[PDB]
Protein backbone atom coordinates (compact mmCIF):
# COMPACT_ATOMS: atom_id res chain seq x y z
CA UNK A 1 0.00 0.00 0.00
CA UNK A 2 1.15 3.26 -0.16
CA UNK A 3 2.33 3.99 3.13
CA UNK A 4 4.48 1.07 2.88
CA UNK A 5 5.75 2.69 -0.48
CA UNK A 6 6.44 6.13 1.73
CA UNK A 7 8.23 4.36 4.48
CA UNK A 8 10.33 2.57 2.22
CA UNK A 9 11.66 5.82 0.04
CA UNK A 10 12.17 7.11 3.80
CA UNK A 11 14.31 4.12 4.74
CA UNK A 12 16.75 4.83 1.83
CA UNK A 13 16.28 8.56 2.06
CA UNK A 14 16.18 9.25 5.63
CA UNK A 15 15.86 13.41 4.95
CA UNK A 16 12.78 13.01 2.48
CA UNK A 17 9.14 13.52 3.54
CA UNK A 18 8.21 11.49 -0.14
CA UNK A 19 4.74 12.12 -0.49
CA UNK A 20 5.58 15.82 -0.54
CA UNK A 21 9.05 15.84 -2.51
CA UNK A 22 7.97 12.95 -5.00
CA UNK A 23 4.60 13.71 -5.45
CA UNK A 24 3.71 15.05 -8.79
CA UNK A 25 7.23 15.56 -10.37
CA UNK A 26 7.45 14.80 -14.24
CA UNK A 27 5.22 12.81 -16.04
CA UNK A 28 4.60 9.82 -14.15
CA UNK A 29 5.51 10.76 -10.47
CA UNK A 30 2.10 10.63 -8.96
CA UNK A 31 -1.12 9.30 -10.14
CA UNK A 32 -1.17 7.91 -13.40
CA UNK A 33 1.39 8.97 -16.17
CA UNK A 34 1.68 9.71 -19.91
CA UNK A 35 4.20 10.84 -21.91
CA UNK A 36 8.17 10.90 -22.78
CA UNK A 37 9.65 10.98 -19.15
CA UNK A 38 11.44 14.28 -18.30
CA UNK A 39 14.57 12.90 -16.89
CA UNK A 40 15.94 9.82 -14.78
CA UNK A 41 13.89 10.39 -11.28
CA UNK A 42 10.53 10.40 -13.86
CA UNK A 43 11.77 7.07 -15.15
CA UNK A 44 11.94 5.74 -12.17
CA UNK A 45 8.57 6.26 -11.74
CA UNK A 46 7.29 5.09 -15.22
CA UNK A 47 9.47 2.11 -14.27
CA UNK A 48 7.10 1.75 -11.31
CA UNK A 49 3.85 2.44 -12.76
CA UNK A 50 4.33 -0.44 -15.84
CA UNK A 51 5.28 -2.90 -12.80
CA UNK A 52 2.03 -1.97 -11.20
CA UNK A 53 0.74 -2.84 -14.77
CA UNK A 54 1.74 -5.85 -14.53
CA UNK A 55 1.14 -6.82 -11.22
CA UNK A 56 -2.94 -6.33 -12.47
CA UNK A 57 -2.47 -8.70 -14.94
CA UNK A 58 -1.43 -11.73 -12.15
CA UNK A 59 -4.11 -13.71 -11.22
CA UNK A 60 -3.35 -13.91 -7.77
CA UNK A 61 -3.90 -9.71 -8.14
CA UNK A 62 -7.16 -10.41 -9.78
CA UNK A 63 -8.93 -12.06 -6.24
CA UNK A 64 -8.04 -9.44 -3.73
CA UNK A 65 -10.02 -6.61 -2.97
CA UNK A 66 -7.09 -4.43 -2.78
CA UNK A 67 -6.16 -2.07 -5.44
CA UNK A 68 -1.77 -2.10 -5.62
CA UNK A 69 -2.08 1.26 -3.46
CA UNK A 70 -4.38 0.24 -0.37
CA UNK A 71 -3.01 -3.65 -0.24
CA UNK A 72 -1.09 -3.98 2.26
CA UNK A 73 2.54 -5.85 2.82
CA UNK A 74 4.93 -6.54 5.24
CA UNK A 75 8.36 -5.37 4.78
CA UNK A 76 11.47 -3.87 7.16
CA UNK A 77 13.88 -1.35 7.28
CA UNK A 78 17.31 -1.74 8.69
CA UNK A 79 20.18 0.17 8.12
CA UNK A 80 18.57 1.95 5.23
CA UNK A 81 17.85 -1.57 3.33
CA UNK A 82 14.65 -3.36 2.33
CA UNK A 83 13.49 -6.28 3.24
CA UNK A 84 10.28 -7.80 1.35
CA UNK A 85 8.55 -10.41 4.17
CA UNK A 86 7.88 -13.87 3.39
CA UNK A 87 4.98 -13.50 4.71
CA UNK A 88 3.48 -12.13 1.49
CA UNK A 89 1.02 -13.86 -0.71
CA UNK A 90 2.25 -13.81 -4.46
CA UNK A 91 0.42 -10.79 -5.00
CA UNK A 92 1.45 -8.39 -2.25
CA UNK A 93 5.33 -10.12 -3.12
CA UNK A 94 4.94 -8.94 -6.26
CA UNK A 95 3.97 -5.01 -5.13
CA UNK A 96 6.36 -4.98 -2.36
CA UNK A 97 9.09 -6.06 -5.04
CA UNK A 98 7.66 -2.90 -7.61
CA UNK A 99 8.18 -0.49 -4.69
CA UNK A 100 11.11 -1.42 -3.23
CA UNK A 101 13.17 -1.23 -6.69
CA UNK A 102 11.14 2.16 -7.10
CA UNK A 103 12.72 3.71 -3.81
CA UNK A 104 16.51 2.16 -4.67
CA UNK A 105 15.63 3.87 -8.05
CA UNK A 106 14.57 7.19 -6.30
CA UNK A 107 17.31 6.82 -4.00
CA UNK A 108 20.09 6.59 -7.01
CA UNK A 109 19.25 9.32 -9.19
CA UNK A 110 19.29 13.55 -9.13
CA UNK A 111 16.43 15.44 -8.11
CA UNK A 112 15.23 18.37 -10.15
CA UNK A 113 13.05 20.63 -8.67
CA UNK A 114 12.04 22.04 -11.79
CA UNK A 115 9.98 19.40 -13.13
CA UNK A 116 8.23 19.62 -9.64
CA UNK A 117 4.83 20.28 -10.22
CA UNK A 118 5.59 19.83 -14.18
CA UNK A 119 2.84 21.07 -16.20
CA UNK A 120 1.63 18.02 -18.08
CA UNK A 121 1.42 20.06 -21.55
CA UNK A 122 4.55 18.10 -22.00
CA UNK A 123 3.51 14.72 -21.19
CA UNK B 1 -0.10 -7.39 17.69
CA UNK B 2 -0.63 -11.38 17.98
CA UNK B 3 -0.93 -12.02 14.28
CA UNK B 4 3.05 -10.65 13.71
CA UNK B 5 3.81 -12.66 16.56
CA UNK B 6 2.45 -15.81 14.61
CA UNK B 7 3.86 -14.80 11.92
CA UNK B 8 7.71 -14.52 13.34
CA UNK B 9 6.83 -18.21 14.86
CA UNK B 10 6.21 -19.81 11.63
CA UNK B 11 9.35 -17.78 10.31
CA UNK B 12 11.60 -19.89 13.02
CA UNK B 13 9.31 -23.00 12.77
CA UNK B 14 7.96 -23.72 9.39
CA UNK B 15 6.02 -26.57 10.08
CA UNK B 16 4.01 -25.00 13.06
CA UNK B 17 0.43 -23.47 13.63
CA UNK B 18 1.60 -21.39 16.72
CA UNK B 19 -1.48 -20.37 17.86
CA UNK B 20 -2.47 -24.15 17.84
CA UNK B 21 0.92 -25.71 18.61
CA UNK B 22 1.48 -23.06 21.61
CA UNK B 23 -1.11 -21.70 22.57
CA UNK B 24 -2.36 -23.10 26.59
CA UNK B 25 0.75 -24.90 26.80
CA UNK B 26 2.19 -25.29 30.57
CA UNK B 27 1.72 -22.26 32.96
CA UNK B 28 2.89 -19.46 30.67
CA UNK B 29 2.06 -20.05 27.20
CA UNK B 30 -1.43 -18.39 26.95
CA UNK B 31 -3.15 -15.42 27.69
CA UNK B 32 -1.57 -14.58 31.61
CA UNK B 33 0.39 -16.90 33.29
CA UNK B 34 1.20 -17.41 37.08
CA UNK B 35 3.04 -20.13 38.87
CA UNK B 36 6.77 -21.88 38.44
CA UNK B 37 7.04 -22.52 34.54
CA UNK B 38 7.09 -26.29 33.91
CA UNK B 39 9.74 -26.52 31.36
CA UNK B 40 11.70 -24.43 29.15
CA UNK B 41 9.34 -23.76 26.70
CA UNK B 42 6.83 -22.67 29.47
CA UNK B 43 9.98 -20.50 30.61
CA UNK B 44 10.22 -18.60 27.17
CA UNK B 45 6.55 -17.44 27.55
CA UNK B 46 7.14 -16.43 31.06
CA UNK B 47 9.95 -14.26 30.04
CA UNK B 48 7.85 -12.93 27.11
CA UNK B 49 4.91 -12.36 29.34
CA UNK B 50 7.68 -10.64 31.54
CA UNK B 51 8.57 -8.32 28.74
CA UNK B 52 5.16 -7.63 27.71
CA UNK B 53 4.88 -6.01 31.50
CA UNK B 54 7.98 -4.15 30.78
CA UNK B 55 6.52 -3.09 27.77
CA UNK B 56 3.33 -1.60 29.84
CA UNK B 57 5.84 1.17 31.75
CA UNK B 58 7.03 2.67 28.93
CA UNK B 59 5.59 5.75 28.71
CA UNK B 60 5.54 5.48 24.88
CA UNK B 61 3.46 2.50 25.14
CA UNK B 62 1.46 4.57 27.74
CA UNK B 63 0.10 6.97 24.77
CA UNK B 64 -1.06 4.51 22.79
CA UNK B 65 -4.64 2.86 22.70
CA UNK B 66 -3.14 -0.88 21.48
CA UNK B 67 -2.11 -2.83 24.27
CA UNK B 68 0.90 -5.35 23.20
CA UNK B 69 -1.72 -7.97 21.87
CA UNK B 70 -3.37 -5.30 19.25
CA UNK B 71 -0.54 -2.87 18.51
CA UNK B 72 0.51 -3.37 15.00
CA UNK B 73 4.38 -3.22 14.37
CA UNK B 74 6.57 -4.03 11.41
CA UNK B 75 8.86 -7.13 10.86
CA UNK B 76 9.90 -9.08 7.81
CA UNK B 77 11.07 -12.92 7.77
CA UNK B 78 13.55 -13.57 5.40
CA UNK B 79 15.78 -16.71 4.89
CA UNK B 80 14.06 -17.88 8.40
CA UNK B 81 15.35 -14.86 10.53
CA UNK B 82 13.60 -11.85 11.44
CA UNK B 83 13.89 -8.39 11.91
CA UNK B 84 12.00 -5.56 13.50
CA UNK B 85 11.45 -2.70 11.73
CA UNK B 86 12.99 0.92 11.72
CA UNK B 87 9.80 2.37 11.02
CA UNK B 88 8.41 1.03 14.74
CA UNK B 89 8.32 4.17 16.90
CA UNK B 90 9.87 3.54 20.63
CA UNK B 91 6.78 0.91 21.87
CA UNK B 92 5.95 -1.36 18.99
CA UNK B 93 10.03 -1.62 18.50
CA UNK B 94 9.92 -2.78 22.56
CA UNK B 95 7.11 -5.15 21.28
CA UNK B 96 8.73 -6.22 18.57
CA UNK B 97 11.87 -7.16 20.13
CA UNK B 98 9.68 -9.22 22.78
CA UNK B 99 7.90 -11.13 20.20
CA UNK B 100 11.37 -11.82 18.43
CA UNK B 101 13.19 -13.13 21.12
CA UNK B 102 10.31 -15.46 22.11
CA UNK B 103 9.71 -16.84 18.69
CA UNK B 104 13.63 -17.53 18.32
CA UNK B 105 13.13 -19.26 22.14
CA UNK B 106 10.56 -21.25 20.76
CA UNK B 107 12.45 -22.27 17.87
CA UNK B 108 15.28 -23.56 20.46
CA UNK B 109 14.02 -25.72 23.15
CA UNK B 110 11.93 -28.72 23.21
CA UNK B 111 8.53 -29.42 23.05
CA UNK B 112 6.48 -31.65 25.52
CA UNK B 113 2.95 -32.40 24.19
CA UNK B 114 2.41 -33.81 27.82
CA UNK B 115 2.24 -30.37 28.94
CA UNK B 116 -0.23 -28.96 26.06
CA UNK B 117 -3.64 -27.94 27.79
CA UNK B 118 -2.04 -28.09 31.06
CA UNK B 119 -4.07 -28.49 34.19
CA UNK B 120 -3.88 -24.90 36.11
CA UNK B 121 -3.63 -26.77 39.71
CA UNK B 122 -0.34 -27.21 38.85
CA UNK B 123 0.39 -23.15 38.46
C1 LIG C 1 -4.28 9.32 -1.70
C2 LIG C 1 -3.31 10.40 -2.27
C3 LIG C 1 -1.85 9.91 -2.53
C4 LIG C 1 -1.41 10.22 -3.97
C5 LIG C 1 0.09 10.50 -4.06
C6 LIG C 1 0.84 9.27 -4.62
C7 LIG C 1 0.55 9.06 -6.10
C8 LIG C 1 0.32 7.57 -6.43
O1 LIG C 1 1.43 6.68 -6.09
C9 LIG C 1 1.29 5.40 -6.76
C10 LIG C 1 2.34 5.26 -7.90
C11 LIG C 1 2.07 4.55 -9.22
O2 LIG C 1 0.71 4.13 -9.44
P1 LIG C 1 0.09 4.88 -10.77
O3 LIG C 1 0.75 6.16 -11.14
O4 LIG C 1 -1.38 5.28 -10.31
O5 LIG C 1 0.03 4.01 -12.10
C12 LIG C 1 0.31 2.70 -11.76
C13 LIG C 1 0.02 1.93 -13.02
N1 LIG C 1 0.93 2.43 -14.04
O6 LIG C 1 3.76 5.71 -7.68
P2 LIG C 1 4.57 6.80 -8.62
O7 LIG C 1 5.70 5.89 -9.29
O8 LIG C 1 3.68 7.40 -9.70
C14 LIG C 1 5.32 7.94 -7.55
C15 LIG C 1 4.76 8.10 -6.15
C16 LIG C 1 5.65 8.97 -5.37
C17 LIG C 1 4.90 9.95 -4.56
C18 LIG C 1 5.08 9.65 -3.11
C19 LIG C 1 4.09 8.56 -2.65
C20 LIG C 1 4.60 7.86 -1.40
C1 LIG D 1 -7.64 -13.71 20.72
C2 LIG D 1 -7.21 -15.16 21.12
C3 LIG D 1 -5.68 -15.46 21.03
C4 LIG D 1 -5.14 -16.02 22.35
C5 LIG D 1 -3.98 -16.99 22.13
C6 LIG D 1 -2.63 -16.31 22.44
C7 LIG D 1 -2.45 -16.08 23.93
C8 LIG D 1 -1.85 -14.68 24.22
O1 LIG D 1 -0.56 -14.42 23.60
C9 LIG D 1 0.09 -13.27 24.20
C10 LIG D 1 1.29 -13.72 25.07
C11 LIG D 1 1.70 -13.04 26.38
O2 LIG D 1 0.80 -12.04 26.87
P1 LIG D 1 0.20 -12.47 28.34
O3 LIG D 1 0.22 -13.92 28.63
O4 LIG D 1 -1.34 -12.08 28.24
O5 LIG D 1 0.86 -11.75 29.60
C12 LIG D 1 1.66 -10.72 29.13
C13 LIG D 1 2.06 -9.98 30.38
N1 LIG D 1 2.81 -10.92 31.20
O6 LIG D 1 2.23 -14.79 24.58
P2 LIG D 1 2.60 -16.18 25.37
O7 LIG D 1 4.14 -15.97 25.73
O8 LIG D 1 1.79 -16.33 26.65
C14 LIG D 1 2.45 -17.48 24.24
C15 LIG D 1 1.59 -17.27 23.00
C16 LIG D 1 1.75 -18.41 22.09
C17 LIG D 1 0.47 -18.86 21.53
C18 LIG D 1 0.45 -18.60 20.06
C19 LIG D 1 0.04 -17.15 19.77
C20 LIG D 1 0.53 -16.71 18.39
CA1 LIG E 1 2.60 7.33 -11.81
CA1 LIG F 1 1.38 -15.88 28.95
Same mark, same amino acid.
Request: aromatic share 10%; charged share 20%; hydrophobic share 25%.
Given at each position: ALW??????????? *?????LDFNNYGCYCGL?? *????? #? #???????????? %???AKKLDSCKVLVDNPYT??? *? %?????NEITCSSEN??????????????????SKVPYNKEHKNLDKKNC
Open positions: QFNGMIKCKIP *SSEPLGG *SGTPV #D #DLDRCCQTHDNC %YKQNNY *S %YSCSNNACEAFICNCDRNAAICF
